[PDB]
Symmetry: C3
């Protein structure tokens, strides 16, 4: 589960995120199949994804790194906990960081912003994301911890060759 | 008291600081009427302000974001505690961060620096400050927490319209 | 031992590091005689240094600030603990930060990276390093804590004039 160990064993099959994230959730280490959301200062699709993706999923949200609004708050983090998701990785900001820090889920983002995001529904789910020098594909697997975030095109702990 | 809630209710009457601060005090959430100090690597006026502003005040210090010296240390933070101030927000650095982290007051700054600031008394108090994309006016109200810092031109929790 | 106090008393004999470090070890405050290592994404010499420098030493490693690989992990940090070193300061990244945070040693670096460094042995030990606006010389003394890092050309707490 350590990204350090995964790199030592499978570096050739891994993409290493170049963007350093701040860890906000109660869980510092988390991993699972990737579900994607591509938005810009709007989180309606982030919410719909959290309410529908399979348990154990790690939702990756490309918010273009905007710091003008938060894309996830305690209400949405709560949904993630209630539906048994592994965590959320956001190329953007979150809010209610105090409350999220007390939840048993992983949450990584580049910063905090108290302003709510737009609620128009613009953006798309299940598309290929591109940020942090990494190509995030639906169905791929992401592993995150205190040292970083790495992505594999399949479950590296269920393979045999 | 949450900046997230204040933005949802009063965004149109609020200024949202664009500069992310590091939180150093024992209190992560604090708010109150603003008192201003405008200086450059000198903290004599910061000290005089802390020794004279009314209880509950949040001292906002524009140190131009300099990282060459600290503008507040444990002695001054102690004064802030003894006189019942709400906290201090500094566009600059502080020192004695270890000691300040144990004090029941809010302290936000952009970094730490072990070097003491000049003691010449240059600068001015009670002037309008301009940094972080925000206009900080004396008498205005500031609310700070783990998600950010927002400024209103009056007490938003004592108003009725 | 506080960098703030050292600056107040000996600023004229001190070099103040301009590069802000993240603190990863169980010890937030540490100091001692400097041992140097100059490398670039390779840590064989970092390991050899940790296995040979005198107890109480603070190993300073100039990794050119690279964020592509880690230069120190839990194995090497463990060696530092077993041989009684004071700490390590790295102009580069580390990994196994979770594990290192539980160790009684000082560790400062600019970030984390899960990828292992090269093991070719390129680089040099006991040379003068130059980074963070500071000239790091073998035999010099370094003092580090929550506020910063300062370097003196001799033990400032064993001198008399």
């Amino acid at each position: 589960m350590k990204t350090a160990d995964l790199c030592d064993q499978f570096l050739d099959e891994l993409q290493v995120c170049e963007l350093p994230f701040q860890s906000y959730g109660g869980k510092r280490m988390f991993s699972g199949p990737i579900a994607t959301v591509d938005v810009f200062e709007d989180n309606v699709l982030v919410r719909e994804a959290l309410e529908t993706v399979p348990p154990g999923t790690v939702l990756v949200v490309d918010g273009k790194g905007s710091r003008r609004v938060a894309l996830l708050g305690d209400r949405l983090a709560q949904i993630a906990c209630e539906r048994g998701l592994a965590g959320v990785i956001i190329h953007g900001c979150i809010r209610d960081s105090a409350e999220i820090g007390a939840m048993p889920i992983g949450v990584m983002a580049i910063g905090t912003c108290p302003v709510k995001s737009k609620k128009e529904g613009k953006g798309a789910r299940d598309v290929v994301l591109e940020f942090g020098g990494v190509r995030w594909e639906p169905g791929a697997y992401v592993y995150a911890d205190a040292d970083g975030v790495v992505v594999a095109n399949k479950d590296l702990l269920a393979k045999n060759g």
